[PDB]
Design a protein around this ligand. Sequence first.
Ligand SMILES: *[C@@H]1O[C@H](CO)[C@@H](O)[C@H](O)[C@H]1NC(C)=O
Lengths: 50, 49
Amino acid sequence: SQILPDPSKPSKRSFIEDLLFNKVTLADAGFIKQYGDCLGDIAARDLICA
Amino acid sequence: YRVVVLSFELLHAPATVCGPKKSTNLVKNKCVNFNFNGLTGTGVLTESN
Ligand SMILES: *[C@@H]1O[C@H](CO)[C@@H](O)[C@H](O)[C@H]1NC(C)=O
């Protein structure tokens, strides 16, 4: 049950796969986190972050 | 010989000595080629917090 996919979530990741996804993060990163934050700032229009 | 020398610093905020160019109004949220006391560039002017 820990390694099999979980049908209770839209993502087909397992519990261990969810822990692996939650462990690796881009918290203190530089350009990568700043570029990824523009995709979370979609509420503001005219955001040409490319 | 009467010698007069001029000295001035560049890229600073209190721009009270400047040229005779005419100022225009802002448009906001548009791709424009702005200019601010000699500091020029191409981009979009938006609001800020
Ligand atoms: C693109 O447009 C859609 C609908 O107008 C909007 O929901 C979405 O946030 C926009 N994306 C960006 C990056 O602005």
